[PDB]
Each structure stands twice: as C-alpha cells, then as structure tokens.
Structure 1
Amino acid sequence: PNIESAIKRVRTSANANAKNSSQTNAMRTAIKKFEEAVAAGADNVDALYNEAVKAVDMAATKGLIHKNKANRDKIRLSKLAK
C-alpha cells in the first residue's frame, strides 16, 4: 500500500480476523456438542442445553452475530430440548 494509514489497517484487521474466527468456532462446537447428545438420548442433557444458550448469548455481545440471529438460534434450540 501507499498511504501510511492503510498499512496499519492491514495488521489490525488481520488480528481481528484471528480472534473473531476463534470465538465463532467456540460457539459452533458448543451448539453441535449439545445436538449430538440430544440425538443420543443421554443423561446430562439440560446442562449442555444451558451451556449452548450461554455460548450464543456471549457471542452476541462480542459483535460476532447480529442480534436477530441470536434470537433465532435460542428459539431453535429451545424447541429441541425445553
């Protein structure tokens, strides 16, 4: 790049991408870990429902999913277990 301020945005956004992807994968695995235990019919089934709900909620305060996506997600999960 040519402008000095364009050179800083490159590393800043690279770092933001790194941590954003880390935390999104965290959320996705929490949800999937609940789904694979409700599809088995296992004991310890409400605790990981709680954990998945909390995971989605925390992702929404980190600016990763909008806010309506989070309402949708919590609705879908609620209709599966509780």
Structure 2
Amino acid sequence: PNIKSAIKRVKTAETRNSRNASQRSAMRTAIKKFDEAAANNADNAKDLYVEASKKLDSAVSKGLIHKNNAARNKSRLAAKLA
C-alpha cells in the first residue's frame, strides 16, 4: 500500500483473520463429531448437541456468523438427533 492508513489495515486484518479462523474451525469440529455420533446412535449423541448449540450461538455474540445461520443450523441438527 501507499496511503499511511492502508498499511495498518492490511496488517490489522491479518490479526482478525487469525482469531476468526481459529474459533471458526472449533465450531466445525463440534458439528463434525455430532453427526457421526448421531449415525452410531450412541448415548453421547444427546449431550453432544448441547455444546454444539453453545458453540454456534457463541459465534453470534463474537460476531463472526449471522444469527439466521446459527438459528438454522441448530434446527437442522436437532432433526438428526432421533
């Protein structure tokens, strides 16, 4: 960049990129270990829904996901619970 205000933006965005990717992949793992548990019909299937719900709507407060996205995913996971 060559505007003084632009040098800061390129480097302050990488810090936001680093923090966002870290906790975004934390969300996907909780979902990853739920649908496989739902298929096996283990007893862990019920309580693995709770922290996955906790991870989803915590991301809304952090502001890296839309509230419709979090509301939608919780509903669709609940159907798989059986």
Q: Shorter-normalised TM-score: what interval?
A: over 0.9
CA shift, 1:32, in A, is: 1.0
Aligned pair count?
Answer: 82
Gaps of 5+ in 2: none
Kindly, what percent of the aligned residue pairs are identical? Answer: 59
Deviations 1:15-47 (A, max 9, x none): 101110111100000011111111111122211
Gaps of 5+ in 1: none
- Between the aligned partners of 2:80 and 2:60, the Cα distance in structure 1 is 21
Secondary structure of the residue that 2:40 maps to in structure 1?
coil
More helix by share: 2
Aligned to 2:36: 36
Aligned-residue RMSD, C-alpha: 1.1
- Between the aligned partners of 1:52 and 1:27, the Cα distance in structure 2 is 7
CA shift, 1:71, in A, is: 1.0
Which AA in structure 2 matches 1:72?
R
Aligned to 2:52: 52
- Between the aligned partners of 1:75 and 1:18, the Cα distance in structure 2 is 29
- Between the aligned partners of 1:78 and 1:43, the Cα distance in structure 2 is 15
Aligned to 1:15: 15
Structure 2 residue 80 is the aligned partner of structure 1 residue 80: yes
Secondary structure of the residue that 1:42 maps to in structure 2?
coil
Aligned to 1:65: 65
- Report runs of 4+ in structure 1 exceeding 2 Å deviation: none
